[PDB]
Design a protein around this ligand. Structure first.
Ligand SMILES: Cc1ccc(C(=O)Nc2cccc(C(F)(F)F)c2)cc1Nc1nc(N2CCOCC2)nc(-n2ccnc2)n1
Length: 273
């Protein structure tokens, strides 16, 4: 299980502040020696069950297998001592959802599209590795100080989930593509809530009736077209992540393609002379 993971000795780890919770233990911000490097640390505390131990070390195992620029990096694991720990890199900019809501309007279209290309490349890698994420959303993406997005999974999302996954529990890389389209909309809106104040039942009814999120403000036509393709009801009609990466790469490498904007439908019109 731990074959792509490095065992870290507990004397090299300092926990500082609680930043969240695991299934059976806290997540902390801390420091790792090997000068000191900031890390996030998920613990498994005394009394955990067999199933919790299997899921915890299984999680570390899969994270260790991933080696990609756009996937969170595992620094290592403590499995030989208690409490057990999963240790990852740390990003001062934090999670993408809060980041964009706190930086409204501060980036260029090219910067936003570049973020999406990195997320798509991480997802293409996961899908190729036969890993279905199931919870792709901006809240599960970390942003580094180069604006590079790292797909993560912080644990627990009707508004991000494809219809077949909601209806009959069919989670695949194609349901992850639906979620990616929602993430595109989150990025281009600077972290707006998908479907605004609609309830979960209202969202599913709207989707089943064929309604889809409208274009963000200032959004390239090509980007809105791409998110719309991610939201095809028929799973097989959605692009694969390889198609998404290819499209986004081509738009970035010919950036004039992003200057054509989709028409924004105003809710409110102001009359002025
Ligand atoms: C410690 C830790 C453990 C596991 C994971 C994680 O991603 N596992 C995972 C599992 C399956 C698939 C994938 C996937 F996607 F790669 F495929 C990834 C991330 C963190 N690391 C971490 N956890 C948080 N949390 C936020 C608060 O709630 C608790 C968690 N915050 C930060 N953090 C904040 C600022 N800089 C870093 N790091």
């Amino acid at each position: 299980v731990l074959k792509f993971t490095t065992e870290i000795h507990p004397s090299c780890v300092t926990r500082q502040k609680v930043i969240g919770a695991g299934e059976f233990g806290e997540v902390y911000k801390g420091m790792l020696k090997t000068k000191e490097v900031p890390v996030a640390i998920k613990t498994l505390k005394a009394g955990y069950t067999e199933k919790q131990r299997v899921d915890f070390l299984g999680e570390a195992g899969i994270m260790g297998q991933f080696s990609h620029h756009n996937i969170i990096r595992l620094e290592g694991v403590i499995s030989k001592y208690k409490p057990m720990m999963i240790i990852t890199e740390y990003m001062e900019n934090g999670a993408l959802d809060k980041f964009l809501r706190e930086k409204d309007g501060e980036f260029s279209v090219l910067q936003l599209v570049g973020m999406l290309r990195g997320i798509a490349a991480g997802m293409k890698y996961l899908a190729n590795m036969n890993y279905v994420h199931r919870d792709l959303a901006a809240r599960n993406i970390l942003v580094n100080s180069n604006l590079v997005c790292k797909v993560s999974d912080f644990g627990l999302p009707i508004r991000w989930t494809a219809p077949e996954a909601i209806s009959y529990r069919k989670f695949t890389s194609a349901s992850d593509v639906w979620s990616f389209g929602i993430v595109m909309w989150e990025v281009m809106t600077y972290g707006e809530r998908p479907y605004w104040e609609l309830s979960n039942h209202e969202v599913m009814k709207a989707i089943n009736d064929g309604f889809r999120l409208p274009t963000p403000m200032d959004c390239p036509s090509a980007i809105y077209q791409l998110m719309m393709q991610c939201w095809q009801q028929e799973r097989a009609r959605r692009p694969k992540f390889a198609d998404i990466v290819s499209i986004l790469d081509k738009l970035i490498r010919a950036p004039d393609s992003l200057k054509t904007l989709a028409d924004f439908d105003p809710r409110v019109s102001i009359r002025l002379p």
